[PDB]
Amino acid sequence: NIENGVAHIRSTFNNTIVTITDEFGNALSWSSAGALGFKGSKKSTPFAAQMASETASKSAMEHGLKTVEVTVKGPGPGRESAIRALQSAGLEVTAIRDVTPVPHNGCRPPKRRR
Amino acid sequence: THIDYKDTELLKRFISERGKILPRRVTGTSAKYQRMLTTAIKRSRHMALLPYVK
Amino acid sequence: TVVRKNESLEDALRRFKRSVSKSGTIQEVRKREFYEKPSVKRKKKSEAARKR
Amino acid sequence: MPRKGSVPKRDVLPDPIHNSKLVTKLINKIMLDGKRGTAQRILYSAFDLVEQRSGRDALEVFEEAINNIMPVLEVKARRVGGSNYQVPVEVRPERRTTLGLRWLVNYARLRGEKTMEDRLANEILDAANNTGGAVKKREDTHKMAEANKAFA
Amino acid sequence: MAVISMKQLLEAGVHFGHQTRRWNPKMKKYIFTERNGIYIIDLQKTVKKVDEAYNFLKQVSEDGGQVLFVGTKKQAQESVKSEAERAGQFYINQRWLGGLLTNYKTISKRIKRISEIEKMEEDGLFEVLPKKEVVELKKEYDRLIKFLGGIRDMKSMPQALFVVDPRKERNAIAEARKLNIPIVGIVDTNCDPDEIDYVIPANDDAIRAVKLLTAKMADAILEGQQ
RNA sequence: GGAAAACUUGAGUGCAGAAGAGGAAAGUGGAAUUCCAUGUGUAGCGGUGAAAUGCGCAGAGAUAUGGAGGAACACCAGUGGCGAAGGCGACUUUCUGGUCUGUAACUGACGCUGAUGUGCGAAAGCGUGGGGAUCAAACAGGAUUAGAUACCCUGGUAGUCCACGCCGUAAACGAUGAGUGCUAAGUGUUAGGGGGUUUCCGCCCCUUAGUGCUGCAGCUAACGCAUUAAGCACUCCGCCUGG
């Protein structure tokens, strides 16, 4: 359990969310932008990813899982600023993947916004 | 000639670096080659000789 | 899905920023933010082809 | 002409006593209502008490006191509408010099004593010892521009 | 995996050869055709040669030997120095000195000098010298590391040699066959493959045809070490 | 015009090649959405110009595996292809329609247009049943505003989907009926046909029929159209004659 894991981020258009887990995903720790006193619409900032990443990573503490090999799963503004701020914790980011859900034209998306 | 759907090595230089199709704009093939290709690349997706995404 | 090692993190990003821009992820989900009408994408693709 | 380009900034004349440009710029800002002599006399009697309450000569003490006044980040408002509209922007070196002189005088005028004989010199030794009232609003700018750091 | 893939091998442009009317008839095996006075190197067959070039050069460094890299063609001079440093082997940029594999009981006499003349001025014995004798002691110093700059730390004979052109570097290959040293090299049209034992048919007057082909052979010894 | 003959171009069948999201029915497949079950795990998630309604401590979201179900078919994908129009986009098989090219064997005007008639005809609708995942009129609630029944947000029914009968209307538009001739050129591209070459297949060259972009003559009230006429003609049909 020590120094082996998968880091999941999915920054949407709001509220960059990060959950770090082991290599066979079991949700070791997680944090958000709402868990740092960002109430609303400040969460869609790269500066919100500057603190939300390591405050789940450094407050994991159960096994010393200190490698991540992060996974990106969202179109957001704080996308690459959550892995740049992950080496502020310094956890040897070794395999970056953009695993985002892309449909094969499957379902009907919602209405246009006037 | 005609593209056979088992001949993977000449057929996977046309697949993308994730599993998509390169357009003939960037590959450079002709018109009727590209759509004789695409009915063979998609029978090879169905029998797991090539993925849908990697 | 590309592994980048034997370097820093500020150079693996430079690989990853152009390994996403040369992919149908960001231009695909920006297209499907809202349902467009089935005859206005045929003109949207026509404007994205006549300009090249 | 502030839209043809930039205005050509002009030269000043340094002080005769301290041999310093920074002293004369302090003379011009404490010069209330064009009175040169009646304000310069007060500055020439507001660094003797500096040199009385500290053995060092005040030309060292002046440029040591203003470094606890001069901030390194400030707020310039950009009209973004519904956003925060408060961008933390660093300070150009000309405004870096001026805005320290501004806070040093504007809070020297709000003390208990009436004479600027010792209204000025008390706040200088406070700024020399990194305390007082003109220092504590630099930290107020460094708790405002450094709180909204999402616009670097 | 094992070989260079077909896409980046011809993207470097190794299928080009030299001109027809400038042809060697012994290179008929390694030519696919000529298009506009220009020949076409058989691309499928040079992959069947560069893997054989990869096989022995893997296991030469397994014994701990020293492979000599030479390059003197002007568009391929500094493409072999940067690949010898990554390999940790010995390079040649300038012209063949004329005996550095055969009369090297007088060349190592001067590799002893370059281990000495730079020591001679880092310590004393430099202030007492005349200011123009300072010049010729330094005019000797750079001209040693011009020609023998890659043979700076080499003190013995090599066990393999890697040439970019047997035509312009025919002085080296003639010294190789007298010493029974095995030889591998990039040949094309206007090159004799008879004196080369381990043949790599590739283009020779293009930089990527060198650099995307001389790098893997430089890489071929690194995973032979461990 | 009638009658008796003769002809081959028009028209049609042969023979030989092609190209195609042309239809219909039955199978197969992957990504995503939603819901459920479970593991692990902890305070928010969601949303906006800002918030709130809503959801969560009866374990939410996030993450991982598995399941069920409905709907569509990313990339290829293009001022590309096919069809009379509406239209048609995963893949496979069966059944079936049309066009184009080339050869000239054959039939010998068999042609064109077509009132009344008879059939197809997007969506939204309606009927009888199914099915119901997303989306979503009506409707409910929260914000905005000067004000709302609007815009925005949460939720949501008919519908969206299938089968069978209807309905027969659209800015159903190239705002241009069909047929056949004739009249500068230049340029992309499609299935070819050739080709010259080849290329390591690359190409670059002349060739019916499509499909675009420029542009003379001519035309138009002017914009513009211009071998895909809105030019020059002939046939037939639909239709207009102030608002």
XYZ file of N, CA, C and O in Angstrom, chain D:
608
model
N 0.347 64.250 -22.985
C -0.334 63.379 -23.935
C -0.322 61.931 -23.451
O 0.594 61.176 -23.775
N -1.332 61.546 -22.674
C -1.392 60.170 -22.156
C -2.033 59.155 -23.090
O -2.278 58.026 -22.652
N -2.323 59.511 -24.345
C -2.668 58.510 -25.344
C -1.848 58.596 -26.620
O -1.901 57.657 -27.419
N -1.103 59.681 -26.847
C -0.087 59.651 -27.892
C 1.044 58.700 -27.533
O 1.689 58.138 -28.425
N 1.294 58.512 -26.241
C 2.386 57.699 -25.754
C 2.538 57.870 -24.259
O 1.562 57.741 -23.515
N 3.753 58.156 -23.802
C 4.001 58.468 -22.404
C 4.508 59.899 -22.280
O 5.091 60.457 -23.213
N 4.280 60.484 -21.111
C 4.733 61.843 -20.821
C 6.218 61.787 -20.473
O 6.662 60.842 -19.802
N 7.042 62.721 -20.964
C 8.451 62.736 -20.550
C 8.631 63.210 -19.116
O 8.379 64.376 -18.795
N 9.058 62.295 -18.247
C 9.244 62.611 -16.841
C 10.473 63.498 -16.671
O 11.445 63.403 -17.427
N 10.426 64.366 -15.666
C 11.387 65.447 -15.526
C 12.285 65.227 -14.314
O 11.974 64.452 -13.407
N 13.406 65.941 -14.310
C 14.441 65.768 -13.304
C 14.172 66.669 -12.104
O 13.584 67.747 -12.229
N 14.617 66.213 -10.935
C 14.515 66.992 -9.708
C 15.914 67.380 -9.251
O 16.913 66.982 -9.861
N 15.993 68.158 -8.177
C 17.253 68.684 -7.669
C 17.486 68.097 -6.282
O 16.615 68.236 -5.406
N 18.611 67.428 -6.031
C 18.812 66.776 -4.732
C 19.098 67.774 -3.619
O 19.483 68.921 -3.853
N 18.897 67.304 -2.390
C 19.018 68.138 -1.202
C 20.469 68.574 -0.987
O 21.397 67.900 -1.433
N 20.691 69.734 -0.371
C 22.071 70.135 -0.059
C 22.630 69.523 1.219
O 23.839 69.299 1.313
N 21.775 69.246 2.204
C 22.261 68.748 3.492
C 22.614 67.271 3.402
O 23.770 66.876 3.597
N 21.625 66.431 3.102
C 21.844 64.993 3.013
C 22.494 64.564 1.708
O 22.974 63.425 1.634
N 22.537 65.452 0.711
C 22.923 65.159 -0.671
C 22.118 63.976 -1.212
O 22.656 62.947 -1.627
N 20.798 64.145 -1.190
C 19.875 63.076 -1.530
C 18.699 63.625 -2.322
O 18.134 64.665 -1.972
N 18.349 62.920 -3.400
C 17.129 63.231 -4.134
C 15.893 62.892 -3.315
O 14.856 63.554 -3.440
N 15.986 61.852 -2.479
C 14.827 61.346 -1.754
C 14.376 62.313 -0.668
O 13.193 62.333 -0.310
N 15.293 63.129 -0.144
C 14.925 64.110 0.870
C 14.103 65.235 0.252
O 13.078 65.647 0.809
N 14.524 65.729 -0.921
C 13.824 66.828 -1.586
C 12.430 66.411 -2.038
O 11.494 67.218 -1.992
N 12.267 65.150 -2.444
C 10.940 64.656 -2.788
C 10.055 64.548 -1.553
O 8.830 64.690 -1.654
N 10.653 64.333 -0.378
C 9.878 64.388 0.856
C 9.525 65.825 1.215
O 8.479 66.062 1.828
N 10.388 66.785 0.859
C 10.098 68.200 1.089
C 8.891 68.632 0.270
O 8.003 69.340 0.761
N 8.821 68.179 -0.984
C 7.759 68.617 -1.879
C 6.413 68.014 -1.509
O 5.372 68.610 -1.805
N 6.401 66.853 -0.860
C 5.124 66.253 -0.499
C 4.607 66.786 0.829
O 3.389 66.871 1.020
N 5.499 67.167 1.749
C 5.060 67.840 2.971
C 4.869 69.329 2.764
O 4.441 70.025 3.694
N 5.178 69.840 1.574
C 4.951 71.240 1.253
C 3.463 71.474 1.042
O 2.956 71.361 -0.078
N 2.747 71.760 2.126
C 1.334 72.084 2.030
C 1.207 73.526 1.563
O 1.807 74.427 2.160
N 0.468 73.716 0.464
C 0.037 75.026 -0.039
C 1.231 75.887 -0.468
O 1.318 77.074 -0.149
N 2.174 75.271 -1.180
C 3.257 75.987 -1.827
C 4.312 76.593 -0.925
O 5.242 77.224 -1.439
N 4.207 76.435 0.392
C 5.157 77.045 1.320
C 6.396 76.164 1.405
O 6.407 75.148 2.103
N 7.454 76.566 0.698
C 8.675 75.768 0.656
C 9.446 75.859 1.965
O 9.829 74.837 2.542
N 9.691 77.082 2.439
C 10.567 77.267 3.585
C 9.960 76.794 4.892
O 10.649 76.201 5.725
N 8.666 77.042 5.089
C 8.017 76.706 6.348
C 7.767 75.204 6.481
O 7.514 74.717 7.588
N 7.893 74.447 5.390
C 7.847 72.994 5.446
C 9.226 72.355 5.458
O 9.396 71.294 6.070
N 10.210 72.973 4.801
C 11.559 72.416 4.785
C 12.239 72.567 6.141
O 13.034 71.705 6.533
N 11.945 73.662 6.853
C 12.438 73.853 8.213
C 11.955 72.752 9.150
O 12.698 72.322 10.040
N 10.728 72.276 8.949
C 10.174 71.252 9.823
C 10.842 69.904 9.576
O 11.161 69.186 10.528
N 11.118 69.565 8.310
C 11.868 68.342 8.022
C 13.297 68.429 8.551
O 13.810 67.460 9.125
N 13.934 69.597 8.425
C 15.248 69.803 9.019
C 15.224 69.816 10.546
O 16.294 69.738 11.158
N 14.048 69.905 11.169
C 13.890 69.674 12.598
C 13.060 68.427 12.890
O 12.559 68.271 14.006
N 12.896 67.540 11.904
C 12.272 66.242 12.135
C 13.204 65.082 11.820
O 12.749 63.930 11.799
N 14.486 65.340 11.558
C 15.465 64.271 11.562
C 16.541 64.472 12.616
O 17.386 63.587 12.789
N 16.543 65.608 13.319
C 17.424 65.753 14.471
C 16.928 64.918 15.644
O 17.730 64.347 16.388
N 15.605 64.839 15.821
C 15.034 63.949 16.826
C 15.196 62.490 16.421
O 15.257 61.606 17.285
N 15.272 62.224 15.114
C 15.660 60.900 14.634
C 17.090 60.591 15.049
O 17.382 59.534 15.619
N 18.004 61.530 14.792
C 19.396 61.368 15.188
C 19.616 61.552 16.686
O 20.723 61.291 17.166
N 18.603 62.000 17.429
C 18.676 62.029 18.884
C 18.249 60.700 19.495
O 18.901 60.209 20.423
N 17.175 60.101 18.985
C 16.674 58.831 19.497
C 17.330 57.623 18.838
O 16.941 56.488 19.128
N 18.307 57.845 17.963
C 19.142 56.788 17.415
C 20.460 57.412 16.993
O 20.471 58.491 16.396
N 21.565 56.731 17.298
C 22.883 57.301 17.057
C 23.258 57.424 15.596
O 24.147 58.213 15.259
N 22.603 56.666 14.722
C 22.911 56.703 13.301
C 22.412 57.997 12.666
O 21.436 58.602 13.120
N 23.107 58.426 11.616
C 22.651 59.570 10.840
C 21.406 59.202 10.038
O 21.251 58.072 9.568
N 20.515 60.184 9.885
C 19.152 59.912 9.448
C 19.041 59.575 7.966
O 18.003 59.048 7.551
N 20.066 59.869 7.160
C 20.004 59.496 5.748
C 20.103 57.984 5.571
O 19.589 57.441 4.587
N 20.755 57.298 6.509
C 20.642 55.848 6.579
C 19.275 55.438 7.109
O 18.675 54.472 6.621
N 18.762 56.176 8.099
C 17.533 55.790 8.784
C 16.315 56.012 7.890
O 15.354 55.234 7.944
N 16.343 57.054 7.048
C 15.247 57.336 6.120
C 15.035 56.196 5.132
O 13.938 55.633 5.040
N 16.080 55.838 4.384
C 15.964 54.755 3.417
C 15.838 53.382 4.067
O 15.484 52.422 3.376
N 16.110 53.265 5.367
C 15.789 52.053 6.105
C 14.340 52.040 6.579
O 13.733 50.967 6.660
N 13.769 53.209 6.880
C 12.394 53.259 7.368
C 11.384 53.071 6.243
O 10.330 52.460 6.451
N 11.685 53.583 5.046
C 10.726 53.514 3.950
C 10.614 52.113 3.372
O 9.628 51.809 2.694
N 11.584 51.238 3.639
C 11.509 49.872 3.135
C 10.457 49.049 3.866
O 9.999 48.034 3.332
N 10.062 49.466 5.068
C 8.902 48.914 5.752
C 7.613 49.634 5.380
O 6.562 49.342 5.961
N 7.675 50.574 4.440
C 6.505 51.291 3.958
C 6.139 50.870 2.541
O 4.965 50.660 2.234
N 7.133 50.739 1.677
C 6.989 50.455 0.254
C 6.505 49.030 0.015
O 7.247 48.083 0.307
N 5.296 48.822 -0.501
C 4.799 47.463 -0.722
C 5.297 46.910 -2.051
O 5.829 47.628 -2.895
N 5.103 45.606 -2.235
C 5.538 44.936 -3.457
C 4.381 44.446 -4.312
O 4.606 44.092 -5.481
N 3.161 44.407 -3.780
C 1.982 44.092 -4.574
C 0.862 45.060 -4.226
O 0.701 45.447 -3.066
N 0.093 45.446 -5.243
C -1.042 46.340 -5.077
C -2.153 45.865 -6.002
O -2.024 44.844 -6.683
N -3.255 46.610 -6.034
C -4.456 46.201 -6.755
C -4.781 47.246 -7.812
O -5.040 48.412 -7.485
N -4.783 46.828 -9.074
C -5.289 47.629 -10.178
C -6.576 46.993 -10.683
O -6.606 45.792 -10.975
N -7.633 47.793 -10.779
C -8.960 47.287 -11.106
C -9.117 47.169 -12.616
O -8.981 48.161 -13.341
N -9.403 45.959 -13.087
C -9.710 45.709 -14.487
C -11.211 45.493 -14.626
O -11.803 44.712 -13.875
N -11.822 46.182 -15.589
C -13.275 46.168 -15.755
C -13.688 44.854 -16.413
O -13.888 44.756 -17.626
N -13.812 43.818 -15.580
C -14.298 42.522 -16.033
C -15.772 42.321 -15.733
O -16.326 41.264 -16.064
N -16.427 43.302 -15.116
C -17.845 43.207 -14.833
C -18.170 42.342 -13.633
O -17.912 42.726 -12.490
N -18.739 41.166 -13.886
C -19.158 40.254 -12.842
C -18.065 39.489 -12.136
O -18.361 38.718 -11.218
N -16.805 39.670 -12.526
C -15.690 39.017 -11.857
C -15.303 39.811 -10.609
O -16.020 40.713 -10.166
N -14.153 39.470 -10.021
C -13.692 40.177 -8.831
C -13.241 41.595 -9.158
O -13.338 42.480 -8.297
N -12.743 41.814 -10.383
C -12.297 43.114 -10.900
C -11.195 43.737 -10.046
O -11.085 44.962 -9.951
N -10.369 42.899 -9.418
C -9.272 43.353 -8.560
C -8.078 42.438 -8.821
O -7.979 41.354 -8.242
N -7.178 42.884 -9.687
C -6.035 42.091 -10.125
C -4.834 42.477 -9.268
O -4.471 43.662 -9.235
N -4.205 41.535 -8.557
C -2.958 41.854 -7.851
C -1.799 42.099 -8.807
O -1.338 41.185 -9.495
N -1.327 43.342 -8.856
C -0.309 43.774 -9.808
C 0.883 44.296 -9.017
O 0.709 45.043 -8.047
N 2.087 43.891 -9.420
C 3.305 44.402 -8.808
C 3.519 45.870 -9.180
O 2.880 46.416 -10.085
N 4.450 46.505 -8.480
C 4.591 47.953 -8.499
C 5.805 48.325 -9.338
O 6.886 47.749 -9.171
N 5.617 49.275 -10.257
C 6.720 49.841 -11.018
C 7.662 50.606 -10.084
O 7.225 51.114 -9.048
N 8.961 50.690 -10.423
C 9.931 51.308 -9.495
C 9.711 52.789 -9.224
O 10.097 53.273 -8.151
N 9.114 53.527 -10.161
C 8.797 54.928 -9.903
C 7.649 55.057 -8.912
O 7.707 55.869 -7.980
N 6.590 54.263 -9.099
C 5.490 54.249 -8.139
C 5.910 53.591 -6.830
O 5.338 53.888 -5.772
N 6.916 52.714 -6.882
C 7.477 52.117 -5.674
C 8.105 53.177 -4.777
O 7.971 53.121 -3.548
N 8.772 54.164 -5.377
C 9.373 55.239 -4.598
C 8.307 56.185 -4.056
O 8.347 56.573 -2.880
N 7.335 56.545 -4.896
C 6.373 57.588 -4.551
C 5.409 57.134 -3.461
O 5.194 57.849 -2.475
N 4.848 55.931 -3.606
C 3.770 55.479 -2.732
C 4.248 55.197 -1.311
O 3.430 55.200 -0.384
N 5.548 54.980 -1.114
C 6.074 54.922 0.239
C 6.126 56.287 0.896
O 5.834 56.426 2.087
N 6.516 57.311 0.130
C 6.498 58.687 0.620
C 5.091 59.153 0.959
O 4.911 59.975 1.865
N 4.091 58.648 0.235
C 2.708 59.060 0.450
C 2.184 58.573 1.794
O 1.586 59.341 2.555
N 2.393 57.288 2.096
C 1.914 56.717 3.350
C 2.680 57.244 4.554
O 2.136 57.273 5.664
N 3.941 57.639 4.360
C 4.754 58.141 5.463
C 4.244 59.482 5.974
O 4.341 59.762 7.173
N 3.698 60.310 5.091
C 3.236 61.640 5.467
C 1.761 61.629 5.855
O 1.364 62.293 6.817
N 0.943 60.854 5.134
C -0.503 60.873 5.327
C -0.935 60.284 6.665
O -2.025 60.612 7.145
N -0.117 59.433 7.281
C -0.378 58.979 8.639
C 0.479 59.682 9.680
O 0.258 59.482 10.878
N 1.447 60.496 9.258
C 2.124 61.374 10.199
C 1.226 62.516 10.650
O 1.478 63.112 11.701
N 0.179 62.815 9.891
C -0.729 63.913 10.180
C -1.845 63.529 11.142
O -2.697 64.370 11.444
N -1.866 62.291 11.631
C -2.963 61.788 12.455
C -2.437 61.188 13.753
O -2.818 60.088 14.157
N -1.548 61.907 14.428
C -0.989 61.464 15.697
C -1.450 62.387 16.822
O -2.195 63.347 16.611
N -0.992 62.084 18.036
C -1.427 62.802 19.218
C -0.822 64.183 19.368
O -1.532 65.145 19.673
N 0.489 64.282 19.177
C 1.185 65.563 19.200
C 0.755 66.429 18.019
O 0.342 65.924 16.974
N 0.835 67.750 18.198
C 0.389 68.668 17.152
C 1.514 69.098 16.223
O 1.291 69.258 15.016
N 2.711 69.304 16.761
C 3.821 69.782 15.952
C 4.343 68.673 15.050
O 4.551 67.543 15.492
N 4.595 69.010 13.785
C 5.240 68.065 12.882
C 6.757 68.068 13.068
O 7.475 67.349 12.363
N 7.245 68.890 14.002
C 8.502 68.661 14.704
C 8.648 67.201 15.132
O 9.670 66.562 14.865
N 7.617 66.653 15.790
C 7.639 65.262 16.216
C 6.455 64.419 15.748
O 6.387 63.245 16.121
N 5.522 64.967 14.959
C 4.571 64.100 14.260
C 5.279 63.230 13.234
O 4.941 62.054 13.063
N 6.261 63.796 12.539
C 6.917 63.083 11.454
C 7.937 62.090 11.992
O 7.966 60.931 11.569
N 8.768 62.529 12.941
C 9.886 61.723 13.420
C 9.446 60.509 14.229
O 10.193 59.528 14.294
N 8.269 60.561 14.857
C 7.761 59.394 15.571
C 7.396 58.268 14.611
O 7.687 57.097 14.881
N 6.764 58.603 13.486
C 6.376 57.587 12.517
C 7.577 57.068 11.732
O 7.534 55.940 11.226
N 8.657 57.848 11.650
C 9.868 57.381 10.978
C 10.552 56.299 11.806
O 10.937 55.246 11.282
N 10.692 56.531 13.116
C 11.290 55.521 13.988
C 10.379 54.317 14.170
O 10.863 53.218 14.459
N 9.068 54.500 14.018
C 8.176 53.351 13.928
C 8.418 52.578 12.639
O 8.465 51.342 12.647
N 8.585 53.291 11.526
C 8.903 52.633 10.265
C 10.337 52.123 10.244
O 10.647 51.178 9.509
N 11.224 52.734 11.033
C 12.566 52.189 11.185
C 12.551 50.906 12.003
O 13.403 50.031 11.802
N 11.591 50.771 12.916
C 11.454 49.581 13.742
C 10.303 48.693 13.286
O 9.838 47.856 14.069
N 9.831 48.890 12.045
C 8.867 48.017 11.362
C 7.537 47.940 12.119
O 6.945 46.871 12.279
N 7.071 49.087 12.605
C 5.846 49.149 13.393
C 5.168 50.492 13.139
O 5.589 51.265 12.276
N 4.104 50.770 13.889
C 3.409 52.037 13.760
C 2.110 51.961 12.983
O 1.375 50.975 13.084
N 1.814 53.002 12.206
C 0.574 53.057 11.456
C 0.767 53.047 9.954
O -0.072 52.523 9.219
N 1.871 53.624 9.482
C 2.161 53.594 8.054
C 2.761 52.266 7.616
O 2.738 51.955 6.421
N 3.301 51.488 8.552
C 3.719 50.126 8.239
C 2.512 49.199 8.174
O 2.410 48.359 7.272
N 1.559 49.362 9.095
C 0.485 48.386 9.235
C -0.546 48.451 8.118
O -1.346 47.520 7.999
N -0.557 49.505 7.299
C -1.424 49.461 6.130
C -0.729 48.854 4.924
O -1.411 48.486 3.962
N 0.607 48.766 4.939
C 1.286 47.949 3.941
C 0.906 46.490 4.111
O 0.606 45.800 3.130
N 0.856 46.021 5.360
C 0.372 44.676 5.648
C -1.118 44.542 5.345
O -1.581 43.450 4.996
N -1.878 45.639 5.429
C -3.284 45.590 5.031
C -3.427 45.449 3.521
O -4.351 44.784 3.039
N -2.526 46.070 2.758
C -2.459 45.769 1.333
C -1.914 44.370 1.091
O -2.288 43.723 0.108
N -1.037 43.886 1.971
C -0.523 42.529 1.863
C -1.404 41.497 2.558
O -0.994 40.340 2.689
N -2.595 41.891 3.002
C -3.651 40.960 3.367
C -4.865 41.090 2.460
O -5.824 40.327 2.611
N -4.845 42.039 1.527
C -5.909 42.228 0.550
C -5.516 41.742 -0.839
O -6.233 40.940 -1.441
N -4.384 42.222 -1.362
C -3.897 41.757 -2.655
C -3.345 40.341 -2.591
O -3.309 39.653 -3.615
N -2.919 39.900 -1.414
C -2.428 38.550 -1.183
C -3.513 37.598 -0.696
O -3.216 36.432 -0.417
N -4.751 38.067 -0.579
C -5.899 37.201 -0.348
C -6.610 36.838 -1.642
O -7.064 35.702 -1.801
N -6.717 37.787 -2.568
C -7.281 37.526 -3.887
C -6.139 37.288 -4.875
O -5.861 38.088 -5.769
N -5.465 36.155 -4.682
C -4.343 35.752 -5.518
C -4.759 34.908 -6.713
O -3.895 34.297 -7.351
N -6.049 34.856 -7.036
C -6.513 34.079 -8.178
C -6.408 34.831 -9.497
O -6.986 34.384 -10.493
N -5.701 35.955 -9.531
C -5.586 36.778 -10.729
C -4.140 37.222 -10.921
O -3.854 38.395 -11.158
N -3.208 36.282 -10.800
C -1.790 36.590 -10.953
C -1.433 36.889 -12.407
O -1.378 38.049 -12.816
